[PDB]
Symmetry: C3
Subunit: 421 residues, 3 copies
């Protein structure tokens, strides 16, 4: 149909993106799950015991029926506060991952679309190669039936034709499997896609690499995730440090009991009482053997690990940006080179035909020139499509990949073409 519509259908019906969204929302709710303990923790309890006497208390039994409405509340517990902040930061991380999955979806959809298109172009060029080989083979066959050309040329052409047939089979299989991958990405089978407009296709030199690097270190996603994890490790250090601190707990209750002491020797008086109390509960772990002073060092070493992960991510980002810039410029230069190559190879094929007419060159040279020509055409098409893919990879490293780049692309796509075979 088109690239934009394909991305729409994907975004609407892609499961990996939906799973990342689910995880994001699950984290944003784990936030409340962690806020819970800082809120009142009202409860309720009961009991019914039957005490007896095994020795020295013989015949002194009892029948209790107790209830309780225990309530709890936390006035100072920094560990829970830090866990809450940690969960907020993890939610931010999962949001970043959702963004990354959006970008990955756009990129994979475009990659599959252009793989399908390159497969179509390759199949068409291979079929054209086969047709040209068959034309030459038929010419030689007729000129042999009359008595001009020898069986040698016929057999050479037959061999080349068979090889081309095998290559065509391979190309058809590749095209079908590419359509299947496109389906796996989007969900539907596309019998007609939007082709490329080479009559107006043009390449634009990318922007300065230093500006790309600034925009990347500012807006990239893996780097952002790394620095978020660094902040998370800092907060973990603080969480561990908070182990040295006290923990208040405003308790409360509405206790009630119904004692019914029984037995012969039972002397105590049956009492049905109710006890309501409200009090605090301090705590201060003076010493624990080194749990806190060890968790702190662990958290500091994990913070070091996160800092090093951040540096590694910066290096990977620089590599990605530089490689994408370089291979974009390379795709441009190769487009130009393969254009010149196609022109020169068509000229050389005409010259080889002239020579075969004369007698200098041989049909094998003609067929090799034809193969070279059509291989050059294939390489040119693949270079165009790789240029597009590499532009997208650039815009991905920058984290500025969105439907707008896909619109800029779709502006390029022109007439439709079938995925048949």
């Amino acid at each position: 149909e088109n690239l934009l519509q394909v991305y729409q259908q994907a975004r609407i019906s892609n499961p990996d993106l939906r799973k990342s969204a689910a995880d994001r929302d699950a984290a944003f709710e784990k936030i409340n799950e962690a806020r819970s303990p800082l809120l009142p923790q009202l409860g309720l309890g009961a009991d019914y015991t039957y005490t007896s006497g095994f020795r020295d208390y013989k015949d002194q039994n009892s029948n209790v029926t107790s209830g309780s409405l225990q309530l709890t509340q936390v006035l100072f517990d920094m560990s829970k506060w830090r866990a809450l902040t940690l969960q907020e930061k993890a939610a931010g991380i999962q949001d970043v991952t959702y963004q990354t999955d959006q970008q990955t979806l756009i990129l994979n959809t475009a990659t599959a679309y252009f793989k399908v298109l390159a497969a179509i172009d390759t199949l068409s060029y291979t079929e054209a190669q086969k047709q040209a080989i068959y034309r030459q083979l038929d010419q030689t066959t007729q000129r042999f039936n009359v008595g001009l050309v020898a069986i040698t040329d016929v057999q050479n052409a037959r061999s080349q034709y068979d090889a081309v047939l095998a290559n065509e089979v391979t190309a058809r299989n590749d095209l079908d499997n590419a359509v299947e991958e496109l389906r796996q990405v989007t969900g539907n089978y596309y019998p007609e896609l939007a082709s490329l407009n080479v009559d107006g296709f043009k390449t634009s030199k990318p922007q300065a690499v230093n500006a790309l690097l600034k925009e990347a270190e500012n807006r990239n996603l893996s780097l952002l995730q790394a620095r978020l994890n660094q902040d998370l490790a800092r907060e973990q250090i603080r969480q561990a440090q908070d182990g040295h601190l006290p923990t208040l707990d405003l308790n409360a209750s509405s206790g009630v009991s119904n004692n019914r002491y029984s037995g012969s020797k039972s002397i105590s008086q049956d009492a049905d009482i109710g006890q309501n109390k409200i009090g605090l509960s301090f705590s201060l772990p003076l010493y624990q053997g080194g749990m806190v002073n060890s968790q702190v060092k662990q958290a500091q070493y994990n913070f070091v690990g996160a800092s090093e992960q951040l540096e590694s991510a910066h290096r990977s980002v620089v590599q990605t940006v530089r490689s994408s810039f370089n291979n974009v410029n390379a795709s441009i230069s190769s487009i130009n080179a393969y254009k010149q190559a196609v022109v020169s190879a068509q000229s050389s094929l005409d010259a080889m035909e002239a020579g075969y007419s004369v007698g200098t060159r041989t049909i094998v040279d003609v067929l090799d020139a034809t193969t070279t020509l059509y291989n050059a055409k294939q390489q040119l098409s693949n270079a165009r499509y790789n240029y597009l893919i590499n532009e997208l990879n650039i815009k991905s490293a920058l984290g500025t990949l969105n439907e707008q780049d896909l619109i800029a692309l779709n502006n390029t796509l022109g007439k439709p073409i079938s995925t048949s075979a």
Copy 2:
């Protein structure tokens, strides 16, 4: 030896499969580990305190020697029941993974076997190519020593011979490394394997793709694992919902104590008592700040995630099945094409020899035709072996991969051949 015996030795002595089996059994025992808490939790305790008086209780000491035979039991705790069911479902999942590992073992063993065989065939064809090149080179050398052919042809043939030597070295290394991988899979080194019977080799068109897809969505393993995980997520939702519910606990004891109050101001009476009691313990978390109402939403979002994983698995399965069907048909068509190509290339080589005898064609064309012929033979052999591998991949996507398919294959294998070099 043969493919069936190789698979037997593997299944008997493959460590990855054994590890998956170990994990399966570990889960089936974690079942009982989780059933435990629902069973009585009898225990035993003791104590020996020496109380004193810091202020207002001075000279009022004590010496207690207490014992206890605490017993516990759970009459209503849905969280534990749901954990038990969860562990049962995880055991089912691990069983599915064990099945998947069985299939993967069969497939990897066959892949390695056929890689070794293709390496042997490639090495043999390369050696034959070298021998033909040397025959032509010796013919030219003699015809030059007599004074017919020029040094030019000798040097061309020498160059081609050297290139073939290098390719032969590469092929020998590949064969040896393939034998080593086969060993890594099975455990033993195989100096004689069972070759292919091309004199009776034939290709059977696979069954309809729609029937394949039905059988796959019914019997595939990744899809089954995905739906099992979906059910697991449902049970997790119920487990979380169960947080709103009460929790009974039938307590019990046989308490005994021996108080020996000491001190000058000690007025209480020394008592050696025994207290046996049996009672219940209700519980009802009216409010907790949102822990349950948050765990529930988390579980619902994880259920959504599992549903999306299931859809992704369905898509991947469709892709796998369609790709396997397509590349099977492609292997058939390529077998036929490369057969025709080998025939035509042998004919063209004979024609080039005739031409070199005449004077039209040149020795370079002869050697290029020979190289084409033997490359075509290599491609044909590799196409056969890939057809077999792709049949196996089909039967894997369907989840119907077992020793029976390997027997159907081994029926194909014929005379033995050595892995030497």
Copy 3:
């Protein structure tokens, strides 16, 4: 600059290695975190309640102000001891992983260095190929302007020149991206590297494969990690078995309270008391429903799993060693073969030039011979560099990879060469 200096800069400024070191130290501190509980666990508590009377205790209130200096200590708890030993073993495992990361760093640095060098050599040979093609094209152009050669040869040469231009573009891009990867590894951009000294380059047959296998099974790192995990599983079995055992706990306190009973019906006497006690606390889980007898079976099955992982690691090690030995010998044989091929191809190119002068051979054959010659040169260079890489892979499987092997290598490197283009 050089290989040794590059490895120095890497080791000093590589983030992955630093992260592995951080994890190692974090484990060696988790050791103390786990030793903690076996040490005194002094604490401190307080309380302030206001009891009332709901029914039958009306007007019998209270105002307590309690304190406590609870102390704890563990005299027999085998679970904690086994956890301590487990953490020690995990620290050993992480140390092994740090060693593995050191080796991986050395190997990746060398791989990137030699990839860059091979890219430089390939680019230079491609530029030389282009220059030779242009020389032949200019000769033909002049001989056509005078009236000797036909437009046919001119066009053939033009086509070949264009193809070479495209290949040169690809090579330049590959070189730049390789330099970028080298940067990602080390941290700095290297405009001048140390080239290879082919004038004294030589290959040494590796040592016997059986000795390699002994040294590997003795000093390899994955195998060592596997057996360490096996021992860890044994200790886990013992940890689970320890669930049957008792658990003493030397309690202690310095309790103090200030009761201020209030109310009209309040008859009890206000008391400000202090209670200091010190006692033990036994424990003996006679029955638990099968938790211990199930954890034990789980640990035994996990021990089986670790044993199978160990066997798999042994097999993978054997495969790695045998493959490295084989492909080293293959690199040697291919070096020799490609040397002979380069010599013979240069001779054949001279012969083709002579023939074109005569009239037998054609310019297409000349250019094909030139392409073959320079492809052979590329293959020779790549074979040298792969021989070096495979020597390093050998020394890696043996676990004997260190700065000394890099020094042995750097001894090979000679004059410098630029990474420009």
